[PDB]
Symmetry: C4
Subunit: 387 residues, 4 copies
C-alpha cells in the first residue's frame, strides 16, 4: 500500500550516525565497485545505499581514469545501507552516469540517465524494470539529482537539469505514479541555477536545497506542491553553504538571488526546521575537506546568521564531498514525524590524491532529539593503493 509522506519533518537538535560502509578500506582487498555519487533512500522496510559504479572494481586496472564522470560503463546499483558497494551483495538498478531513486510504499522507482550528452535519455524503472522514458530536451547533458527523490501518496517527484553547468540552463520538475510520468513543469529561474537537488518530504510539499553551479555560493531552494505549482529561490540565511564559497563574515544572505563571486560548487543539502534550517557544508571554504552541519535560527525565511547548534562529522583534515537528504519512513522509525537523515560522500583519489583511480565512501546520519558531539568518521583508506 502507498506511503503517506505528508507529515512534517521532525525537529532535531542533533544527528546520530546510522552507518559507515568502509567501502574503500575494504576495497583494498575485497571486490568493491569503484563508484561515486552515492546516496540513501528508504522504503517502509529498509534503507538502501544507491551508487554509480564505474563499471569496475578497486585495486584493478579498470579502475584507471574513473575520474571521467560520464561513460557507458557506469550503471546505477544499490545495497542495504552500511554495506559497502560490493559486487556479490549488489542489486542492479539502471544503466546510468547520473541517477535518482525512491520507494513509494510498494515498489522502487529508479531513474538512470545515460547515453551521449547531446541526446542522453533518462530511463525510469519501476519494480525492477523500465516503465517510462525522458529524452534530453536541451541537448546538453541530461542530468538529475544524485539524491533520493520524493514520493507522497503514490506520486514520486524529482528534478532535472539540461543545459551548461556554468551559465544559465533549463530546470524541470517531473512527477510520476508507478514508473509512469504524469505531468511536468518548467522552472523559470533566470540568473539562477539548479543542479543535483536534495529533497525530502515536509507537509505534502517537496523541499529541495539544490546546487547553483553558476553564480551561487549560497544554495537555492524550491518548494514543490502536488499539482506542479512550485516556489523557488535561495536559502535565505546570511551564511553560504556551497564549496567553493566566500567567508561568512563578508557574506550577506539572500532569500532571492545568488550571492558570492564563485562559480563552482558541490552537492549539498539542507532541512527546514520550522523557520530555522539545518545546513550542511564542508569545513573548508575551498577544497572538498571535512563536513559540518549548522542550525541557523530563522534561516529558512530570513537573511539570518544566528546559529544555535553546530556539529562536525568529518574534521577538516579529512576528505569530504557530496551530501544528500532523505527521510526515515514513519513505518520504520515509528515516529509521527518524518525523521530527517543525511549522508556524506567521502571522495578519495584524483584529483586531490596521487592514484590512477577515484572513488568515494559514505556515512549516514539521522535526526535525533538530543544534541550529538562533534567527531570524525572519515574514510580511512591508506592511499595510494596497490594500483
Amino acid at each position: 500500500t502507498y506511503m503517506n509522506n505528508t507529515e512534517a519533518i521532525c525537529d532535531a537538535k542533533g544527528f546520530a550516525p546510522f552507518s559507515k560502509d568502509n567501502g574503500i578500506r575494504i576495497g583494498s582487498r575485497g571486490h568493491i565497485f569503484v563508484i561515486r555519487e552515492p546516496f540513501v533512500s528508504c522504503s517502509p522496510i529498509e534503507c538502501r545505499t544507491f551508487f554509480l559504479t564505474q563499471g569496475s572494481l578497486l585495486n584493478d586496472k579498470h579502475s584507471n581514469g574513473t575520474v571521467k564522470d560520464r561513460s557507458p560503463f557506469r550503471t546505477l546499483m544499490s545495497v542495504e545501507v552500511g554495506q559497502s558497494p560490493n559486487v556479490y551483495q549488489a542489486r542492479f538498478e539502471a544503466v546510468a552516469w547520473s541517477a535518482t531513486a525512491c520507494h513509494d510504499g510498494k515498489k522502487w522507482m529508479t531513474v538512470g540517465v545515460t547515453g551521449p550528452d547531446s541526446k542522453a535519455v533518462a530511463v525510469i524503472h519501476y519494480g525492477g524494470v523500465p516503465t517510462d522514458v525522458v529524452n534530453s530536451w536541451a541537448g546538453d547533458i541530461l542530468r538529475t539529482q544524485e539524491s533520493s527523490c520524493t514520493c507522497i501518496q503514490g506520486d514520486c517527484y524529482w528534478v532535472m537539469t539540461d543545459g551548461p553547468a556554468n551559465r544559465q540552463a533549463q530546470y524541470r520538475i517531473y512527477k510520476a505514479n508507478q514508473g509512469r510520468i504524469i505531468g511536468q513543469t518548467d522552472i523559470s529561474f533566470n540568473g539562477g541555477h539548479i543542479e543535483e537537488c536534495s529533497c525530502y518530504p515536509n507537509d505534502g510539499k517537496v523541499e529541495c536545497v539544490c546546487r547553483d553551479g553558476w553564480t551561487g555560493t549560497n544554495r537555492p531552494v524550491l518548494v514543490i506542491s502536488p499539482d506542479l505549482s512550485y516556489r523557488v529561490g535561495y536559502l535565505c540565511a546570511g551564511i553560504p553553504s556551497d564549496t567553493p564559497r566566500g567567508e561568512d563574515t563578508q557574506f550577506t544572505g539572500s532569500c532571492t538571488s545568488p550571492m558570492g563571486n564563485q562559480g563552482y560548487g558541490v552537492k549539498g543539502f539542507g532541512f527546514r526546521q520550522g523557520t530555522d534550517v539545518w545546513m550542511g557544508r564542508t569545513i573548508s571554504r575551498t577544497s572538498r575537506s571535512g563536513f559540518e552541519i549548522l542550525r541557523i535560527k530563522n534561516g529558512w525565511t530570513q537573511t539570518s546568521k544566528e546559529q544555535i547548534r553546530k556539529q562536525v562529522v568529518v574534521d577538516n583534515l579529512n576528505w569530504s564531498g557530496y551530501s544528500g537528504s532523505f527521510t526515515l519512513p514513519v513505518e520504520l522509525s515509528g515516529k509521527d514525524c518524518l525523521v530527517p537523515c543525511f549522508w556524506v560522500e567521502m571522495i578519495r583519489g584524483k584529483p586531490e590524491e596521487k592514484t590512477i583511480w577515484t572513488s568515494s565512501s559514505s556515512i549516514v546520519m539521522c535526526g535525533v532529539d538530543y544534541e550529538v558531539a562533534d567527531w570524525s568518521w572519515h574514510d580511512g583508506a591508506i592511499l595510494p593503493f596497490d594500483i
Copy 2:
C-alpha cells in the same frame, strides 16, 4: 497462477537500455564465470540473465581453451538482470552446453542439453529440479535456442535442431506444461535451416526469428500455434539481417526461401510490428562487431527495404555477437501489451583477440514509445587480461 501471454507485442518507436553487467571488466579482478550464449527471460516478479558457464572463472588458468563450445563442465546458471555472471550471486539451473529457459507464472522451466554429440540429452527442469527428458533424435548435436522460450497460459514452447550445422537438418517444436513434455512437431523445411531461434509471444501464437546456418543471410521466421500447427519461412524484408551477410543493395528479400551466397551466421532476433518489423543486426556485414536495429515498413509481410527508424547500441568499433528476444510480463511493466525487449552478447577474446580465453558480456534493451538516440554501450574490458 498462470501467466497469460496472449496479448500482442507493444509498438515501439525505439528501445531504451535496461541494464549492463560489465561482467568481463569486473571479471578482471572479481570472481566472474567465464561464459557465453547469455540471454534474458522474465517472470512476473523479476527478469534474470541466463548464461552458460565454461565451468570456470576469468583471469584463471581454467579459462584456457573455453572457445571449444561444448564440454562436460558447461552448466546453465542464472542471476538477476544487470548483475554479472558471478559465482557468489549465481543460481544453478542445469547441466548444459546449450540451454533455454522461461517462467510461466508459477515456476521456472529450464532445459539444458549436454552429453555426447551423437546422443546428447536435453534435461528439462521445473521448480529447481528435472522433470522430463529428450534424447538426441538424429545423432548430431542435440542443440536448442540459447534464448528465452515461450509460455502462454501454462504451456511453454521452444524449438530444437538436430543435424549438421551446415547442410539440411531436422527441426522440432516442443510444448510442455509443468516441466512435462505434452506433444511435439516436426518442421518440414527442406532447403531451409533453423538454429538458435529467438521467440516472444504475440497474440497467443509464438513468433521466432531463427538462424539459417546453411544458405541464409536473411533469417527464417516461424509462427507456432497452441496446437502445434505451425507456419514457417524467412522474414520477408528486402534486407538481410544475418552475419556474414551480403550488402543490402544487392539483396532481394524473400518471404519464402533463403537468400544470399553465405553459409554461416550468428544468433539474432526480430519483432513483428503490425506488418513492420524491428530487426537487429551487426553493423559489420562480415565480423561480429557493432549492433544495430532497424524498423523496415511492412517488412514482416513484404520484400520491403523501406525503413522508418534505426538506432545503434554498439558502434562498429566494438565487439558484438548474439541477440535475443523476450518480453516484459504485463505483471511487471503494467502495460496492456507485451513490451518487446532484447539483449546483445558482446564476445571478447578468441578468435578476434589474443587471449587464452573467450567469454562475453551483455546489455539489455526494452520497448519504449519514444525514439532512443544512437550510442554505444560496448563491453569495455582491456585485453589481454593477466591471463
Copy 3:
C-alpha cells in the same frame, strides 16, 4: 506440514544429470571450501548439497594436510544443489567431521558428529539449532551416513556405526521427530559390517545400501520399518559393487553373507527396482576412478548377474569416489512416486595426486523414464594448483 514419503520409488530405465558444481575448477581462483564427503538431500522446495569443510579454502596454505579425515575445524555446511561449496553462498549446518541431513516437510534436521574418537558426540539440529544429542556408545569413532537421512511422516531415521573400521563393530538405527530422538535399535549382524549407509524411502520402509568395510566386496542392505523392527543382510546380486572388489566372473552373489577376500571399500548406493536393483560402482575394481550404474534383473532378491541396463557417468580415466542416494519429494517432481536420484563424489589430490591438499567435486543424477547415454562429467580441475 509433514512430508509423506510413503510412496514407492519410481521405476527408471536410466538417469539424467541434475547438476555439476565445478567446485575445484572454480576453486582454482574463487573462494571455495576445501571439502569432502558431499551429498544431496531435498526439501519440498529445493535440494541442497551438504558437505564437510576442512575449515579452509582451496589454493590456500590452510588447505594443507586436509587428507587427515577428522579434525576440530571440519563443520557441516550446505548450499543449493549445483552451487559450489563456496563461502559467500554457504549456510552453516553443524560442527562435524561426519554428518547426515534430511528435511521432513517443515524444517531441516542435521546431525553432526565431532570431538575425540573415544568420546565423539553427534549433535542433532532442527531448524537451525541443536535439539538433541548422542554420545559415542562404544568409544571408537562415532560416525554416521555422509548421506541423506530419511523422513516419513514426521519421523526421520538414520544409521550410525561405533567400533573399528576393520573387524566387527556396533551398528544402530536412530529415529527422531523434530530434532528429538524417539527410540533406537541395535543391529545384530555378527560377521557383517555397516558403514556410511545410503538410504531412500520406499513404501514407508527405509532402504539402505551400506558399506561393509570388514570382509565385504558385496554391499549390505537393511530395510527399516517405522517401529524399529528391521531386516538386514547384503544385496543379493551375483555382482559385487564395492571398491576394492574382485571381478564379476569369479564372484558368487549372496543375499546373506559378505563375499570376497577384500577388506576395504568406499561409500556407495543402490536402488530397489521391484526385485531388480540399480547399483552404482567405480569402473575400476581397484582404484577410485570412474563411476557406473547397472540394473541387474531380480538382483534385490536373487543371486542374479543378469543386467538389462548400464550407463557410465565418469569414464575410467577420471577420478570417482563416494556415491549416495536420496529422492525428489513428490512436492517438487510432481510425480506420484519418489523419483530416485544420486550423486558421485569426485575426489582430487592426495593420495592419487601430487598436491598438498585433498578435496572433491560432485555431480547429481536423477531418475527418468528414458534410457540415458553413457558419458563423463568428470571433475575437470588441472592439478597441481598454485599450491
Copy 4:
C-alpha cells in the same frame, strides 16, 4: 508477536557444540572482516553472530594496528551463526566500537556506541534504523555489553558503564520497548566494578555475570527485575572465574565483595543452575589461553567450591578470550525452558603473537541434558599470515 522470555533456564549436565566459523583460517585466503568482541543472540527463527569490524579485512594492509580497540571505522555487523564474519554475507548493524544486540519476537534491537571517549554516543537501532540515543553521561568511554541483551515481553534490557576501566565507575541499566528508551537505573556498587556483562533470561528477571576490572578476580552478578528494581554483588562460589586470577586453593569466595589482588580481567559469563552455577573461565589463570566451564554445587548462593561437573572446549595450548551468554528461544528449541548457550572468542595476533594485526574467531556451545566430553575446537589459523 512478542517473545515471552519468562521461563527459567533449562538445567544442563553439559554443553554441545552449536557451530564454529573458522573466520581466521578462512580469512587467510577469503574476504573476512578483521574483527573482535563477537557474540551470539537469537531471534525466534535464527541466531546470528554479531561482531565488531575494524573496518577492514584480513591479509590486508588495513588490518595493521587493529589492536587499538576504539576507532571511527569499527561498525557493528552480523551474520547467521557459524558463518564467518565475511563481507559478502554480512549485514550492517550500527556504527560501533562497542555494541550489544537482541531480538524481541518482532524486530532486532541494536545499540552501537561510537565517537570520542569523553562524549561517545550509544545509538540504538530497531528494525534496521536508529530509533533512540544515549549520550556519554560521565565523559569516560561510554561502553556496553559486547554480549546479547535481554528481552522479556517487549522490553529489552541491557547494562552500560561510564568511568575509568580501573578504579570506581558509574554503571546503569537501560530498558527499552521498540528501540525507544523507557526508563533507566543507576547502580550503587561502590568498591565494586561492572563491565561487559553477560546476561540471559531466567524467570522474568535478567541475570548478568559481569566483569570487575577494578579489584575483582571473582566476577560480579546482578539480577534485574522488570521495574528497574535490581540486586547486585559477586557470584558467591569459592572459585574465581576471571583472568588474571589467583589460584582456587588460596581463594575464599564472596557473595558480597570482590576478592583477589588482581586488577584486570576479560569478559566472561555464568549461568544460574537452581543454586548451582555453570561458570566459564580460561584454563590459564594468567594468559588468555584455553576455555573451560565448571558447575559448582550451590555456588550461586554459597561460597561453594564443590564441583560436580567440568568440561573443556579449548585446551590450554590454544588461544581463548571473551565468553558470552544467551538463550535459544523456546520457539526454536521447542523446549519449555530457555536452553542455556554460550560462545568463546578465540583471539589471534597481537599481543600474544607476532603479526601486524589482531582478530578473533568464535565457537558456539548450547545446553543439553547429557554430559559432553572434554575437547578442543580452537581457532586453527597458521600465523603469521602473508601480512
